[PDB]
C-alpha cells in the first residue's frame, strides 16, 4: 500500500480561475473563500475569478495561492480514509508557509494575514531599488553560482532542476549578464513579472519583522514534518519553523535537492493548490507521478487513488 508526500506551490502558479472549480463544486470551497474574503477585508471571490489588477501585489498572491492550497487540502482530507497522512510535505518559496500551516501550525485566518504581511513586506524591503528575478535556462547551477559571486548585484534564487534556475537582483544588472549567459549555453532567459528579489539579501531588511509575526502566528503542532527549502533538512516544531521560514527569504530556494533527497521516501506526490508548476519540475526531478490537485477532477483523481492504493 503506497505512500505520499505533499507539495505546495509558490509564485508563478497563481491564475485567473485559481479555485473556481472548488467554489462551485463544495459549500466548505465557499465558506473559506467568505472567511478569507473578511480576514483579509478585500473580496477573494473576484481577486481570484476575473481580471482585477490587485492579484498581481506579492501581497494578493501569497495569500491567493496559500487560499487554493488550503482549500484542495480540506476537501481531499475530509474525503482520505482516515485524512492526509503523508510521510513529508514540501513547499516552494511561499509554498513551505503552506505546508507549514497545514501541518497544524497555522490557523487559516492567521496564515493569510502572515501570508499577505509575507508579501507585503517582500515589496516594501525591494520598493525603489529596481528589483527583479530572471528565469534561466539550459546553465549549470555550478556555473550560475560562480558567476553570481563575481558579479555585483546579483544572487542565484532558485534551484529548479532540470537546470532551470531563477536568478534574483537589480534589474539592469540582470538584464546586462544576457551576452555572458548566452555564450554560457542559455536556451532561454526570461524576466519574471515582479518588482520584488526574494532569496538574497534584498529580503535583509525584513527578516526581524516576519521573525517576530512567526514567533506570535506559530502554535506547536505539526501532524508531519516539512523540508526546508533552506536547509533541505526536515522539521517538525515552532522553533525551527520560526528559524527557517525566517533564513528561507535570503537564501536559494533548493528545490531540486530537497525533491532527491526525499524522493526515496515515497511512491507519489500531490500538488495542492492550483497549477501544475511543481509536476512539471518534478518531470525533470524523478519518475514518481504528480497528481495536481487544483480542481473537482484533480480532487476527484486523487480521492481515486486513495481508495486504491491507500
Known sequence: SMQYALLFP???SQCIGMGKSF???????????????????????????????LLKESAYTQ?????????????????????????????????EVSAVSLSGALDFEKALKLTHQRGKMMQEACANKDASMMVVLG????????????????????????????????????????????EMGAKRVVFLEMSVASHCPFLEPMIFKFQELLEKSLKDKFHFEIISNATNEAYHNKAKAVELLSLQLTQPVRYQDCV???????????????????????????????????????????????????
Not at 466548505?28 to 478569507?36: T, V
Not at 496559500?66 to 474525503?79: D, F, G, M, P, T
Not at 550560475?144 to 537582483?169: D, E, H, I, P, Y
Open 260 to 310: 532527491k533527497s526525499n524522493n526515496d521516501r515515497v511512491d507519489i506526490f500531490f500538488e495542492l493548490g492550483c497549477g501544475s508548476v511543481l509536476k512539471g519540475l518534478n518531470k525533470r526531478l524523478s519518475n514518481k507521478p504528480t497528481i495536481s490537485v487544483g480542481d473537482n477532477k484533480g480532487l476527484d483523481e486523487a480521492i481515486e487513488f486513495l481508495e486504491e492504493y491507500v
Open 10 to 12: 509558490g509564485q508563478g
Open 23 to 53: 467554489y462551485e463544486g463544495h459549500t466548505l470551497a465557499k465558506e473559506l473563500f467568505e472567511r478569507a474574503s473578511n480576514a483579509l477585508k478585500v473580496d477573494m471571490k473576484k481577486t481570484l475569478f476575473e481580471e482585477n489588477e
Open 139 to 182: 546553465v549549470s547551477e555550478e556555473s550560475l553560482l560562480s558567476l553570481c559571486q563575481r558579479t555585483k548585484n546579483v544572487w542565484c534564487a532558485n534551484f529548479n532542476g532540470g537546470m532551470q534556475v531563477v536568478l534574483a537582483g537589480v534589474k539592469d544588472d540582470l538584464k546586462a549578464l544576457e551576452p555572458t549567459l548566452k
Open 63 to 95: 495569500p491567493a495561492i496559500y487560499l487554493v492550497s488550503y482549500i484542495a487540502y480540506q476537501l481531499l482530507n475530509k474525503q482520505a480514509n482516515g485524512g492526509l497522512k503523508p510521510v513529508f510535505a514540501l513547499g516552494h518559496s511561499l509554498g
